[PDB]
Amino acid sequence: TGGVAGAADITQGLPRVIELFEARRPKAKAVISEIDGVVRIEETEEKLSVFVESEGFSKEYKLPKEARLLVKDGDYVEAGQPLTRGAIDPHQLLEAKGPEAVERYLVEEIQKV
Amino acid sequence: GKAQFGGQRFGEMEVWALEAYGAAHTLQEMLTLKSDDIEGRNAAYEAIIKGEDVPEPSVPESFRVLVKELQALALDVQTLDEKDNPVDIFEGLASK
Amino acid sequence: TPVAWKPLLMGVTKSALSTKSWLSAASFQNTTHVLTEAAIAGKKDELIGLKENVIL
Amino acid sequence: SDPVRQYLHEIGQVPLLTLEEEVELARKVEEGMEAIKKLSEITGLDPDLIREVVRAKILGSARVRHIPGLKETLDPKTVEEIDQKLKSLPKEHKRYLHIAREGEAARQHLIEANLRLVVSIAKKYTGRGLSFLDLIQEGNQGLIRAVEKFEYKRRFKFSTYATWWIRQAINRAIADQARTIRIPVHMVETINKLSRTARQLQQELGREPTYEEIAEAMGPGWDAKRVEETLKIAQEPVSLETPIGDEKDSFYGDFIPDEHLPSPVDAATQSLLSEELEKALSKLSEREAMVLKLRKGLIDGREHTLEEVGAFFGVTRERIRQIENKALRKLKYHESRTRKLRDFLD
DNA sequence: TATAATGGGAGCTGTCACGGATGCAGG
DNA sequence: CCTGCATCCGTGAATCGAG
Ligand SMILES: [Mg+2]
Ligand SMILES: [Mg+2]
16 A cells, blocks of 8 residues: 555454454443334433334343444334444344344355454 | 485464365375384385385374383373274273 | 264364363463373374474 | 562561571471480381471471381371370470470471571572572572481581582582583582683683693593593584574474484385395205295294294204205395395395 | 671662453442 | 353464574
8 A cells, every 4th residue: 555544454453353253242342132122212322222022021221322223213223223322232232133144144255354 | 304314394273274174194194104103114115115005003103202202101091992992092002 | 772962062272272282272271271181081083184284 | 470579578577587597496396306316216216207297287288298218107196106106205205206396396487487598599609500499499408418417516607508419419410410411419510620721711812712722721531532422412402492503484394304203215115125025045945945934033023043934844954044045045036037136235 | 716796788760451360448 | 959151261363584
């Protein structure tokens, strides 16, 4: 390159590759849903929380106020469907969606780099 | 090294290259006749200068070193057959 | 009664160290931990893979 | 955690003896030794055997082993037979058993008490090839020797007589265990004398001395040749794991070839020589070649005299020597014509 | 074989990021 | 008394050359 500023080289992407091959949990981790449900939101200045409510049970997800959201309020998401923008915990995905979704996620995410 | 009239190092990466190719007898050559096998390399050189084909490679000396170094750590390492009966790669020289 | 099992995902390093062939496991990494747990269990290497046969 | 500091803590528990206490212990020890002597005069048993029995009961059952110096094997059965044999003695006699026991106990307490002395002495001998703890333990051996060889009647403080044996044991240890190639103590004293000599000369001459200069200052019997020989002997081996380069990827022993095991060229040449020699011995008859094969030791690997070969083939020894002359001469004519074995002359 | 002597001595300090075991206070 | 988080120690850290 000559030392000019540009897009992310292999130096940036390689840690992601190793992060996926080693099945490690991301430092900045994306939060997914263990079960299916509908979205209900709660927002405050010093507190932000997103409720995933099903017909049989209800799960609360307390998030930092600065967190990004991939889901619209009142949507219908699958088990282990991305909510927070970021890398998915392969083991959270494993206990939720199963082996096939993990294999597909690993292969695709590694390929991306 | 050139100074010591030494051979070229066939690293584990070069081993991978042969493995990936699937060249088993070329790899077995490097691991035995062309390096670490004593009886095999003497019979090899003898075969080539006699015009005869190279002999079947014997068990490497460096593995025997591994075995005895592991025995020095008080760990028993035994080579076996399918009958789970001990096989002596030292050919009676290590047994009383 | 059948055994109830759960799929388990482990990194390439821990997977390569948890392989059934102790010759390959020891010749990879953490030789001490591998050799001890193998010597205790009286493990045998069936020489299934490439590494074990390369060593041999 | 730290072996040295831990041993120093184990030493600080035992208090230092008063003059009275020290004399008392040494007294009981000496009287204990006399008691073992007297018990040997009565019982009719070995003083060493008795001493080890008394030593066993004092130390307890925690230590039971066979003593090299003793003739019988030392086991709890034996020491109980002897202890009961000793306690089968009358009042004025059985008294000595109590004296011997008290003596050994005083001996244990005396050696235990003066371990601080060994530490403060062995601390000066460090860096001579033996570790600190190795020196201390060797000084402990000398301390044991000092205790058993001490006589309290001389009114000498025990530290005075102990120090000599302690230094003696330490110096003996350094002289014995240091060098990888073990060298006799007298020869080490010679080499070290050569060191102080060469250092004295280098200090006065403002340069490193010649072999002849040291030979002069050494006195009679010393020439330059003998000095050089002595120095050659004192040469210590170097580690094969010696680092080559500023990286850790290279070792010293990696550059050293093996001179013992035959190269493929050697083995091939040897096989070619045996084959060509058999090709040469087939230009003879089987009998006149067998005479040579038995003579030089190709077969069986033994060289025979003319009498044995004559005792085998059934002819006279002069016939055998005649056959061997004819065979060698035929092989000479075969060699002169074929020009095959010539290259193997090396 | 004998004045008396009695608890050592030098540390290496500018990597790092992982797994797993120990231990701590907290519900 | 048992879960969870902080923290400790031990283990890794490309290849071939020469040196
Ligand atoms: Mg002289
Ligand atoms: Mg960590």
